[PDB]
Structures are given as C-alpha cells and as structure tokens.
RNA sequence: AAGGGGACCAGCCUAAACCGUCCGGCUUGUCCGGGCGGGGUCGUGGGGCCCUCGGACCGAAUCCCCAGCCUAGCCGAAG
C-alpha cells in the first residue's frame, strides 16, 4: 500500500516521499501516529501542489536576488 | 426461450469532465474537502473543453379550470 510520509523515517523513506507498506503497518501504526497519509489521488495532488509551490517561491528568490547581483557587481 | 398473433403504449432524471459560488481544514494555494447552482445524459458512441460557421417549434407523468362520473332523488302510457 502506498503512503505519503510526513516525516523522515530511518530505513523507510524521506518526508513527502511515496513508499510501499503493508496495509496493517499504515493503518495501525503510521497513520494514527501522524507519520504518514494514504497516497490517495486527493493527497497526491496536494503533495504535488506543494512541491510545485516551493519550487515557485524558490526560483523567485534566485531571480529577485539575482536582480540584485545585477545592480551590485556593476 | 426466441419468433408469430394480440392488450396497452412513453419515456425521463442523475454521477463524472468543465465553470461559478459559499463554507472549513492546515500542509497556504493554481490546495484538498463538503454543500448548492450551472453544464451533462449517450451506442448511427455520447459528453466536456478550445476554434469555426448557423438562431421559432415541441411540451409533461406537475399545477389550474371544465365536461363526465359517484355519494340523495324525479317524471313516466292505457279499463
Ligand atoms: Mg409478440
Ligand atoms: Mg382489453
Ligand atoms: Mg413502445
Ligand atoms: Mg476559505
Ligand atoms: Mg472535492
Ligand atoms: Mg473546491
Ligand atoms: Mg464546490
Ligand atoms: Mg467524442
Ligand atoms: Mg416527468
Ligand atoms: Mg311514477
Ligand atoms: Mg302507471
């Protein structure tokens, strides 16, 4: 069963990553302890749109700060 | 059972794509979810979206009215 990790877990996976686990592990351990969520089609959109938004708010630093390396250095 | 002969006869509404709005979750937006409205309903496949040209008839199974009918009756030939 596929889940989306909310936290990095040793010898499991990294935060925001999709991993395969047995249904019982997800249902009786990971999910109740807030450590993951089901890789449902709803959640995969929400994860996507966060990975997307972080890359957006990153590039617009490396560009409006890059605009500063234009004024300075000249 | 098909098929044939007859009785009767009638076909519709949604879900999803997409659009709009309200509400709330936190994991902050191009988010996810819930409600309502729009859109849509099909097998010659149909629908959505985007271009392109083109602009009255239908009509309920709902509602209103009225014939008709039912729940009492009446007239009715000639020793
Ligand atoms: Mg027949
Ligand atoms: Mg008959
Ligand atoms: Mg018929
Ligand atoms: Mg809100
Ligand atoms: Mg939804
Ligand atoms: Mg929504
Ligand atoms: Mg909605
Ligand atoms: Mg088609
Ligand atoms: Mg009808
Ligand atoms: Mg009499
Ligand atoms: Mg008499």
From Swiss-Prot:
One of its GO terms (biological process) is translation. The chain holds residues 1 to 74 of 148 of the full protein. GO terms for cellular component: ribonucleoprotein complex; ribosome. Belongs to the bacterial ribosomal protein bL9 family. Keywords: Ribonucleoprotein, Ribosomal protein, RNA-binding, rRNA-binding. The lineage of its organism: Bacteria, Thermotogati, Deinococcota, Deinococci, Thermales. GO terms for molecular function: rRNA binding; structural constituent of ribosome. This is Large ribosomal subunit protein bL9. Binds to the 23S rRNA. Extends more that 50 Angstroms beyond the surface of the 70S ribosome. Disulfide bonds: none annotated. Part of the 50S ribosomal subunit.
